[PDB]
Design a protein around this ligand. Structure first.
Ligand code: AR6
Ligand code: G4U
Ligand code: ZN
Lengths: 7, 294
């Protein structure tokens, strides 16, 4: 479950 | 931007634009045409910069939505989402896909323009959502709409699922939600998996109008490089992955795709109006071999 982010 | 998290990291906004001088530009777009032609599997990655010509602002350009918010200002919408027209970049991607010169399209755009341009849904991953698409929270059926669904952030839209169930034909009645990710939402499982496979097996990843600051999307083009392929970054601002580009092109994306289509003997089709396509049409045959830079 990879998430929308910068880092 | 209504109901969405005010806790997001907006990244680096407002970096100045760079413009490759014309001679350099023409030579880099010839080199692009060559790698498109030499490459078997070609994957495109598109961000907000391919829709600025249609009147929709980007997030982090000089006049982007995030850029303006950092500095106290609201952004400027020239066009509404419903009345926005596919660009020559969108239409060039339709044609590239028709003749076998595009394997898969990964987009971070929620503007609905890929879908509305006619680009086949089965070769498209909309990793961040689509303002026109809502999804049933119970059976996962998607509904593509002609006007924007009215919520953002995976909220209930107010409409219910109309699917007749396999046994007994009764309407599902599940909650319809928008497909627009908020900050730190989980990406769509299937679309991500497919974008990742495509990106891992590509010979050539080409990015257009993204600063590549958001993951995991922004990193899919590196996967390509990881397994031996090349990487081309087309963007006016610098991008986070500039140091990994085989070829960088700082110019307007419409302008690059026009020359790129000229060099490969492809006509960019005109856009008849919103026309959703679920499955890629049968391939038109590979084009007649293109001519060379003198
Ligand atoms: N006509 C053009 N030609 C070439 N480049 C352009 C053009 N117009 C703008 N640019 C460049 O195009 C780039 C657009 O970069 P960004 O604004 O970060 O958009 P993203 O898609 O990568 O943002 C990712 C996500 O972040 C958000 O939170 C959303 O969730 C997004 O989905 C800039 O560097 C411009 O210089
Ligand atoms: C469509 C390009 C210009 C943006 C205008 C609509 C606002 C974008 C909604 C997406 C919110 C991003 C949250 C993820 S970090
Ligand atoms: Zn349902």
């Amino acid at each position: 479950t990879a998430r929308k982010s910068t880092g | 931007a209504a109901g969405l998290s005010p806790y997001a990291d907006k990244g680096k906004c407002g970096l100045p634009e760079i413009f490759d001088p014309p001679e350099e530009l023409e030579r880099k777009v010839w080199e692009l045409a060559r790698l498109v032609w030499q490459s078997s599997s070609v994957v495109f990655h598109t961000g907000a910069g391919i829709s600025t010509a249609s009147g929709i602002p980007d997030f982090r350009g000089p006049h982007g939505v995030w850029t303006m918010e950092e500095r106290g200002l609201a952004p400027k919408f020239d066009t509404t989402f419903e009345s926005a027209r596919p660009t020559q970049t969108h239409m060039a991607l339709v044609q590239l896909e028709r003749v076998g010169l595009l394997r898969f399209l990964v987009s971070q755009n929620v503007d609905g323009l890929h879908v509305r341009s006619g680009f086949p849904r089965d070769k498209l991953a909309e990793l961040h959502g689509n303002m026109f698409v809502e999804e049933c929270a119970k059976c996962k059926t998607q509904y593509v709409r002609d006007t924007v669904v009215g919520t953002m952030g995976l909220k209930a839209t107010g409409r219910l699922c109309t699917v007749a169930k396999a046994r007994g034909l009764r309407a599902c009645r599940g909650e319809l939600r928008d497909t627009i990710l908020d900050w730190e939402d989980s990406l769509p499982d299937r679309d991500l998996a497919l974008a990742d496979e495509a990106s891992r097996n590509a010979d050539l990843s080409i990015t257009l109008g993204t600063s590549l600051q958001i993951r995991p999307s922004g990193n899919l083009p590196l996967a390509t490089k990881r397994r031996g392929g090349r990487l081309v970054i087309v963007n006016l601002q610098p991008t986070k992955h500039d140091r990994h580009a085989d070829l960088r092109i700082h110019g307007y994306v419409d302008e690059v795709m026009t020359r790129l289509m000229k060099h490969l003997g492809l006509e960019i089709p005109a856009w008849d109006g919103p026309r959703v396509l679920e499955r890629a049409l049968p391939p038109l045959p590979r084009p007649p071999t293109p001519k060379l830079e003198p």
